[PDB]
Every structure is written in C-alpha cells, then in structure tokens.
Amino acid sequence: ETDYPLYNNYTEPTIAPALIAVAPIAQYLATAIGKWAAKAAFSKVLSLIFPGSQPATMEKVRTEVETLINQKLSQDRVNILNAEYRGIIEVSDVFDAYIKQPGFTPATAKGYFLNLSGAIIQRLPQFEVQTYEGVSIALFTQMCTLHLTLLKDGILAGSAWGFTQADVDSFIKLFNQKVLDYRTRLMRMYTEEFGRLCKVSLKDGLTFRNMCNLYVFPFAEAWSLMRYEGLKLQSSLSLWDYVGVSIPVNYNEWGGLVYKLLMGEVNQRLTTVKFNYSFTNEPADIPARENIRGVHPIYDPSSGLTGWIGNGRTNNFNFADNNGNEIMEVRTQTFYQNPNNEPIAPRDIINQILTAPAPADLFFKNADINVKFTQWFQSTLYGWNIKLGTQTVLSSRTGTIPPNYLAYDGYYIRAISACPRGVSLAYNHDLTTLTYNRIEYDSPTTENIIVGFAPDNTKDFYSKKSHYLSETNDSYVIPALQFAEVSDRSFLEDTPDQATDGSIKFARTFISNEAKYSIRLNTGFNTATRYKLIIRVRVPYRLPAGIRVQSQNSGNNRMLGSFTANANPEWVDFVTDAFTFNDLGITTSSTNALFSISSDSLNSGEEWYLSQLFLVKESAFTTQINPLLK
C-alpha cells in the first residue's frame, strides 16, 4: 500500500485543464469560430498541430492521455503512428510552402490541395483500431481537425487556389458528408470504450469520460460550428471525481438512472449535503470499521425533488422523523467484565447524520475525501475521511488516512452524489424525470462519493438564476439544462458531444412540451441592436405543429419563430428572423423576460431533443457553408 498523498486519485498532481497539450489548438479554434480568416486559418492550424513540422506535440498528447486513462501503447503502435505523422507532414509542408509564394500557380495549388486531402483521408483509419481506441480517440480527433479545417478554407478561397464552381460545390458536399461521418465514428469509439469500462467499473468509465471532456468532445462541438461565423465556442461539461469501491454499471443503467442521480436538480445550486455515517468495533478481534450508508444532496429547499441515494435510516425503532425534532445520532456503548483480566475495552456503535451546508460564497471550491481499505480474513474493512472546503466533516476513527485533494483550477464543486451498491439498477427508468417524480433510489449502503466540478463560465447562472447579457460581448450560448422552468415528462439525455452536460428529451403526450429561459440586461446594453436566435434540436419523429420560439415579457408576448419539423435523425439548427430588444419590450429594469421553446403534445413512443441556444448579433453572423446542399 501507499501512505503518500493523492491528487484526484492519482499519485502525482495532474495537469490543469487549461495547461494540457491541446489548449492552444482549442483557443485558436474558438478565435476562428468567432471570426474566420480566409485562406490563412489552415496554416495556423497546421502550425499549432505540427509545430516546426514536428510530431512532438502529438507525442506529448499521447503521453498525457496514457497517463490519464492508465492505458499505455506498445512501441510498434507508436512507430506506426509516427510514420503516419511524418507521411502527413511531408505533404502538408509541400502545400503550405507552395501557398506562401506571392504569385504562385493556382492549378499547382489545386493539385497539392487534392494530394493533401487524399493523404489525410487515406491515413485516417490507422487511428480507428478498436483494440487501442481508448487511447487513439484523442489523436484521431486532432487529425480530423486538420482535415475539416483544410476543406473549409478551400471553400472560401475558390479561384485563388485554382478551383472552379463545380470544385467548390463538390467540396461543400464532401464537407457536409464528413462533418457527420467523423462525428459518428468518434462517438462510436467513445461509446464502445465507455460502455466497456463501465461494465468493468464505474470509476474507470468516469475517468475515461473526464479525459474525453478535455481532449475529445470540445473539438467535436467545434466541428459543428465551423459552417457558421460569429458563434461562441464554449464547453460546460463537468469533471467527476469518484472515491469508493468499484461498482459495475451497464450502459442502459448509466443513461437511465445513474447520470440522473449524479445531476439531480440540473438548474439548481447545491445548498446542503447530508451523509449517513456508521462506526462500529463490537467484535474484539475485528478492527474498527466505518461505513457510508447514504448521501442526500439538497438543492432547492422548497422543492423536495432529490432524496437519499443510499440509506437514511439510523435505527429500527421507526423513530426517525417524529416528535418535532428529527433524530441525529445514536451511540451505544457496551461494557464487559473478565475475572482473569483487568483492562476493560468499551465497545462503541455510532450511527449519525453528518450535515454540511454550502459556504458563505455559495459554492465549495475543493474537497479532501479519501477512503482506506483493510483486509481481515478475506473480508474488506473501510475507513473514510470527508472534508468539504474548510469544514472538516468526518475525521477517521480507524487511524490516520492520507489526504486526497480534489480540485481543478478553474472549476468549482456543483454537485455531490453517490451510486447505489448491492442493488439492481434496472428499475424506475421511465419514472426518473427532470421534475415531479422523486429523484431517489433505495440501497442499504453506497460506499462511494461522487463530486462534480463545473467550469467557472457557469458560476453566474447558479448564483443569479438568470442569463445576464452585456453590450461588449458578441455571442452568447445557453445550455438547455440552464432553464427557469420545464414541462412534465422531460428527461435528461447525455449528449456529451454538444460540449454541454446534456440535453432535454421531451416525451410528454399531453398539454404541450415547453422550456423557458430567463434573460436579464446589464446597464449600458443597446436595445436597438439587431439580434438572431439559433436553436439546436434533434427531431426523429415528424411534428405537424413544428417548433416555436416565443418571447414573453409581462404579457407582451411576441412570436419570434415557427419552424417546420420534419423527421431527421441528425442534429438541426433553426435560425430565427432578425429582431431588436425594443420590439420585445425589454429594458434594463425588466426582471420577468423569458425565451420559450415550445411544441405540441406527442404520441406514444415519440420524443424530441433540445440541446442549446445561440444568441448573436446580425452583423457578426453569416452562414458560409450551406447545409442544405448535401
């Protein structure tokens, strides 16, 4: 065993999320999504992926991923990947060198462009071997980034690079095909590896998902915004620390129960957390042991949606919550008497409910939770250490336990939950919705604690409960889960490729399916500026009434858009007409402005998905690659 301190379950501290090897690529990708520089973005992307025509950054990426996911690659695979790298680098160098010459021949540039695209397409499948997919899904990603960028620039510089109109149309078709095929293959690899690791243990799947949230999914989301110009590239995925024993979780059970228990109230701030602690040393031979029996996270104090994840019972007298005051701690002390001996060892049995409210600044920034294992005649004993922020919640009575620092620079603790242990996870799937139904699951023990960290770009929503708009910014992205209120029979769907913590699945067969979002304006905001809304939805089944985006403000209800909903398994973007905030009757004092996305009632077995909203000025927005020309 090891008594050295730990860092998010790792023996040595981990790299900050902003200091990983794929950070400048993502930063320039966001900068280019904001405003694309024609016939020049591909050179910068190439300089950032292959600096100095060297594959050293990709090897750094491979080493970091191998460090994170505890999976290493054989030397032969490394040599093969480096050979493919050099093969791509040769043609990329030829093309980039021929571009920069002032007055080059455009047909030669066309030939080099075709050569480079073909070489990238040819060498892509080397990173799609499933036996190593969990390690290569990162690398593969960047390679697609090098291709989809290329084609994009090629569509912008037509006759400048010797392209006819049919050339540009063929390139647009190839782009509209590949931007779906690459996403499909990346999601295949992710889901395969994630389901496999979760069937092994939940902790390993959480680790793989934490890796993909930093190295894979942000770029997959950036791919879906390259056809536009002016939108914001922002990720809101959470990083999940798991501390406890191993629990196998099916992929049907993850998306139907476990993730819903981990999120809880997806639009509420954590206000209190309660733990069910048990300590006992009644047998004189068995050393002392400690048990975590259940976790209860309380968000909205006046709602009552989230319940216990494990077991909130402390005794068998049925006297839990009665006679005004609720029970808090039960301590039984037993004494013995030996005639042949003199020392007396009193035995203690404690069952209590530890309570931890949120700090003065609403959120915990870090935690120090750890668990210690022990063996004793083929039986595992446990010891726990719990500390949230500066409040020591539980010091181990079974001896000192090394600290395990749970922290991420630029992240804050948003949710604290657990996973049921020893019980079937195949029930209450169709009942666990976003509202109304009780978010709970009964299990004798959990023996695990799961902490979710959210990026600081979401800190304002969970504090003010509304989306504030500034005049200085140009683009705003609103995740679906950051709503004011939602309709009934709505589910949380895990769509990590959207760079968000999920999407909303509407499947209510009565009244309507509606989702509202609260908007507020800061002082100095221009209300005469023209804006537009973009809605990202997936509609597998036809809706005769279509989708409707509406603006509601103290009864001044105006219709912003009505879109025909046809059957389509892929993701679709609906753009509204231009509008100004004076046409909506909203000023700096309006506190009940709302954006509502609504649709009629569905039928049995039907649903439709909502992902995110994009609000951008009319001047800074322009569609460059047509999606209908497939």
In the complex, what is the shortest distance from the CB of residue 404 to a second copy, in angstroms, rounded to a whole number?
Answer: 29
Q: What is the dihedral of CA 144, 149, 152, 156, to 10 degrees?
A: -160
By CB under 8 A, residue 174 contacts a second copy: no
By CB under 8 A, residue 329 contacts a second copy: yes
In the complex, what is the shortest distance from the CB of residue 148 to a second copy, in angstroms, rounded to a whole number?
Answer: 37
Stretch that binds a second copy, among 81-89, 200-208, 243-251, 541-549 (CB under 8 A): 541-549
By CB under 8 A, residue 460 contacts a second copy: no
Q: Which helix (H) or strand (E) holds 115?
A: helix 106-123
Of residues 324 and 569, the one with the C-beta less far from a second copy: 324
By CB under 8 A, residue 375 contacts a second copy: no
Stretch that binds a second copy, among 24-32, 163-171, 247-255, 321-329 (CB under 8 A): 321-329
Of residues 325 and 472, the one with the C-beta less far from a second copy: 325
CA distance from start to end of the chain = 59
Task: Give residue for tokens 């500390």.
Answer: 387
Task: Give residue for tokens 């395969």.
Answer: 192
Q: What is the 3-state secondary structure (H, E, C) of 234-269?
A: CCCCCEEEEEECCCCCCHHHHHHHHHHHHHCCCCCC
By CB under 8 A, residue 176 contacts a second copy: no
| Residues in binding contact with a second copy, number by CB under 8 A | 67
By CB under 8 A, residue 324 contacts a second copy: yes
Among 10, 373, 376, 427, binds a second copy (CB under 8 A): 427
By CB under 8 A, residue 252 contacts a second copy: no
Dump the DSSP string for 291-329: EEEEEEEE-STTT--B--SS-----SSS-SB-SSSBP-E
By CB under 8 A, residue 564 contacts a second copy: no
Could you tell me if 264 and 457 are in contact, meaning their C-beta atoms sit under 8 angstroms apart? no
Buried b (16+ CB within 10 A) or exposed e, 14-53: beebeebbbeebbeebbebbbebeeeebbbbbbebbbeee
The span from the CA of 6 to the CA of 4, in Å, is: 7
What CA–CA distances, in Å, run from 458 to 195, 268, 454, 522?
A: 28, 12, 7, 17
By CB under 8 A, residue 465 contacts a second copy: yes
By CB under 8 A, residue 589 contacts a second copy: no
Stretch that binds a second copy, among 64-72, 221-229, 338-346, 359-367 (CB under 8 A): 338-346
Cα angle for residues 608, 609, 611 (degrees, 5° grid): 160
Among 11, 184, 323, 472, binds a second copy (CB under 8 A): 323
Nearest to 61 by CA among 93, 97, 22: 22
Among 107, 286, 511, 578, binds a second copy (CB under 8 A): 511
Among 16, 423, 578, 629, binds a second copy (CB under 8 A): 423
Stretch that binds a second copy, among 64-72, 256-264, 404-412, 540-548 (CB under 8 A): 540-548
In the complex, what is the shortest distance from the CB of residue 346 to a second copy, in angstroms, rounded to a whole number?
Answer: 9
By CB under 8 A, residue 438 contacts a second copy: yes
What CA–CA distances, in Å, run from 204 to 142, 241, 242, 411, 431?
A: 24, 11, 9, 21, 28
Of residues 138 and 547, the one with the C-beta less far from a second copy: 547
Of residues 1 and 285, the one with the C-beta less far from a second copy: 285
By CB under 8 A, residue 2 contacts a second copy: no
Q: For residue 70, is it left (φ>0), alpha (ψ between -120 and 50) or beta? A: left
Of residues 114 and 545, the one with the C-beta less far from a second copy: 545
Burial of 180: CB neighbours in 10 Å, binned 0-12, 13-18, 19+:
middle
Q: Which helix (H) or strand (E) holds 191?
A: helix 165-200
Contact mark string toward a second copy, 339..358, x via CB under 8 A? -xx----------x------
Among 475, 548, 581, 586, binds a second copy (CB under 8 A): 548
Could you tell me if 277 and 293 are in contact, meaning their C-beta atoms sit under 8 angstroms apart? yes
Of residues 396 and 596, the one with the C-beta less far from a second copy: 596
Stretch that binds a second copy, among 109-117, 328-336, 448-456, 573-581 (CB under 8 A): 328-336
Among 19, 284, 360, 528, binds a second copy (CB under 8 A): 284
> How many Cβ atoms from other residues are within 10 Å of residue 589's Cβ?
8
Radius of gyration of the chain measured on its C-alpha atoms = 28
Stretch that binds a second copy, among 77-85, 180-188, 497-505, 552-560 (CB under 8 A): 552-560
Among 44, 77, 232, 313, binds a second copy (CB under 8 A): 313
Among 129, 130, 336, 522, binds a second copy (CB under 8 A): 336
* CB neighbour list of residue 124: distance below 8 Å, 6 or more residues apart: 140, 143, 144, 147
Q: CA quadruple 210, 214, 215, 221: dihedral positive or negative? A: positive
Binders of a second copy in range 253-282 (CB under 8 A)? none
Token pair belonging to 390: 């500066």
Stretch that binds a second copy, among 187-195, 366-374, 498-506, 545-553 (CB under 8 A): 545-553
Could you tell me if 453 and 411 are in contact, meaning their C-beta atoms sit under 8 angstroms apart? yes
Contact mark string toward a second copy, 599..628, x via CB under 8 A? -xx---------------------------
In the complex, what is the shortest distance from the CB of residue 166 to a second copy, in angstroms, rounded to a whole number?
Answer: 42
By CB under 8 A, residue 302 contacts a second copy: yes
Q: CA quadruple 483, 489, 495, 498: dihedral positive or negative? A: negative
What residue ranges bind a second copy (CB under 8 A)? Answer: 284, 302-305, 311, 313, 316-318, 321-338, 340-341, 352, 423-424, 427, 430-431, 435-438, 442, 444, 465, 484-485, 488-489, 510-512, 516, 518, 545-546, 548, 550, 554-555, 557, 559, 562, 591-592, 594, 598, 600-601
